[PDB]
Amino acid sequence: TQSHAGQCGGIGYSGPTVCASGTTCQVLNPYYSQCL
Protein backbone atom coordinates (compact mmCIF):
# COMPACT_ATOMS: atom_id res chain seq x y z
CA THR A 1 0.00 0.00 0.00
CA GLN A 2 2.40 2.83 1.20
CA SER A 3 5.81 1.39 0.10
CA HIS A 4 4.57 -1.05 -2.59
CA ALA A 5 1.96 1.18 -4.40
CA GLY A 6 -1.66 -0.11 -4.79
CA GLN A 7 -3.61 1.73 -7.59
CA CYS A 8 -3.09 1.25 -11.36
CA GLY A 9 -6.82 2.14 -12.09
CA GLY A 10 -8.95 2.23 -15.34
CA ILE A 11 -11.97 4.09 -16.93
CA GLY A 12 -11.25 7.73 -15.79
CA TYR A 13 -8.96 6.86 -12.77
CA SER A 14 -5.89 8.73 -11.32
CA GLY A 15 -6.84 10.20 -7.87
CA PRO A 16 -6.04 7.90 -4.85
CA THR A 17 -9.16 5.58 -4.80
CA VAL A 18 -6.72 3.23 -3.07
CA CYS A 19 -7.48 -0.41 -2.26
CA ALA A 20 -4.27 -2.34 -1.19
CA SER A 21 -1.21 -3.86 -3.05
CA GLY A 22 -2.52 -5.53 -6.30
CA THR A 23 0.91 -5.47 -8.16
CA THR A 24 -0.97 -6.77 -11.25
CA CYS A 25 -4.01 -4.91 -12.69
CA GLN A 26 -7.45 -6.73 -12.73
CA VAL A 27 -10.80 -5.28 -11.24
CA LEU A 28 -13.17 -4.69 -8.24
CA ASN A 29 -15.87 -2.73 -10.18
CA PRO A 30 -15.59 -2.08 -14.03
CA TYR A 31 -13.84 1.37 -14.02
CA TYR A 32 -11.38 0.54 -11.13
CA SER A 33 -8.91 -2.04 -12.70
CA GLN A 34 -7.37 -3.11 -9.33
CA CYS A 35 -7.19 -5.17 -6.11
CA LEU A 36 -7.30 -9.02 -6.28
State CA 19 to chain mean position distance. 6
Phi, psi values for residue 26, rounded to 5°: -105, -105
Beta strand spans in 1-36 (E): none
Q: Which DSSP category does 15 fall into?
A: S
Rg from Cα positions in the chain? 9
Report how this structure was experimentally obtained: NMR
Give the separation between CA 36 and CA 21, rounded to whole angstroms. Answer: 9
Q: Which DSSP category does 27 fall into?
A: -
Residue range(s) defining the domain that contains residue 18: 1-36
